[PDB]
Ligand binder design. Sequence first.
Ligand SMILES: CN(CC(N)=O)C(=O)c1nc(-c2ccccc2)[nH]c1C(=O)O
Length: 146
Amino acid sequence: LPPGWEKAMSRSSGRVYYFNHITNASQWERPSGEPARVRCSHLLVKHSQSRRPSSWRQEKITRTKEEALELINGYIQKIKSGEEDFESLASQFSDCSSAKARGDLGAFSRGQMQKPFEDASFALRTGEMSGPVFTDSGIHIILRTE
Ligand SMILES: CN(CC(N)=O)C(=O)c1nc(-c2ccccc2)[nH]c1C(=O)O
């Protein structure tokens, strides 16, 4: 299976699924399908322990890391169900200044982003969205777009 993928058994179903320990993605289908540069968007939820606990949305970020993960997990659910799209939630709720660009960060090479962010970005397939990715900025959902 490609970089980071493992087979697991589901807790509720007993059905096989696939987990990526680099992107935190999980899916039922087996993944079937490294570039010099990728383009990604993200949605960042900061918490009280973030490096800079402040954003355009809230001068003082006070939510806990656990409450930030809860928020991230709700956004992932709405995006996977198609109830909301990624761009719309990033524009409204991302604690990054890239919110005003629907979360788009542009293209980047290895060696530019925080490591856990980079590693997740380069392990995603074009079109594919990460699970929760933790960095010192806070918690991210990453969408690889190119
Ligand atoms: C850069 N930084 C402070 C830090 N020392 O991590 C942030 O917290 C931050 N980090 C990001 C970020 C993090 C990863 C990838 C792209 C952007 N955006 C912000 C922001 O405020 O707007």
